[PDB]
């Protein structure tokens, strides 16, 4: 925080897929400590994955990671009382965390009646350049490089 860098807390893999990434995916769904309900609806999401255009239950999640994950972001690095924010390359763990945030934390807005059609089909859509989280990254890269000239020298 002030003195030095802090530890980062690597996690435990799944009880089924033996994945840390899917574990972290569960943990950015979990509200009020109800882990079993979020875990079970994510296994239900994998069951919806497996039936409708069943290709691979995990490659669809990796392609959902493909079409979302950033490479650029601006950061307000002024020096002498300016507003010269610099498009900066992102840390890789923060990159994946922004990807999980753009997948799940945008999926509140589908508004369909079945309670996990906003989850399962939503991450089905992100595998093949659909879902509005892809265009979130698109407009993020387009508002990036808006100061490509007068900020990349720092």
């Amino acid at each position: 925080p002030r003195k030095g860098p802090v530890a980062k807390r690597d996690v435990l893999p799944d009880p089924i897929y033996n994945s840390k990434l899917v574990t972290r995916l569960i943990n950015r769904v979990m509200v009020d400590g109800k882990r079993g309900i979020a875990a079970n609806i994510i296994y239900n999401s994998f069951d919806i994955i497996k039936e409708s255009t069943g290709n691979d239950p995990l490659e669809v999640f990796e392609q959902a990671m493909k079409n979302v994950m950033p490479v650029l972001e601006v950061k307000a690095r002024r020096v002498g009382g300016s507003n010269y924010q610099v498009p900066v390359e992102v840390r890789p763990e923060r990159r994946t965390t922004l990807g999980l945030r753009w997948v799940v934390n945008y999926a509140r807005l589908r508004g369909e009646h079945t309670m996990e059609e906003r989850l399962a089909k939503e991450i089905m859509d992100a595998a093949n350049n659909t879902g509005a989280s892809v265009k979130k990254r698109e407009d993020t890269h387009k508002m990036a490089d808006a100061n490509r000239a007068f900020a990349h020298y720092r």
Binding site: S82, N83, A146, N147, A149, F150
Partner: protein, 117 residues
Amino acid sequence: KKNIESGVAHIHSTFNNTIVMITDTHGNALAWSSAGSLGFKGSKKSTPFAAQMAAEAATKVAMEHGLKTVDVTVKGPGSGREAAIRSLQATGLEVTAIRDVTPVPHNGCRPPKRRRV
């Protein structure tokens, strides 16, 4: 129109505004662009954010009349000329002469009062 296609651009900048004009080799004028003319107000005309889009709105009208090569002339040293050139390269020009001529006296007249702020 006439497709002159080889000219010189002029970058004039203050501490509160900047003006880019792409001219001929005379330089007779083709098109100018000003940071106030693109909708900005107040103090925001100092930043090179207006320099990029002023260069774009200059070069569009410029190469509608046919334009390949361009030379750089810089006056009024501030923030504008740092990013005006590299934004001027971006819409397809052939920057090949960069000069910074400043109107410099040899102690001719007097500067005004200081500011007691």
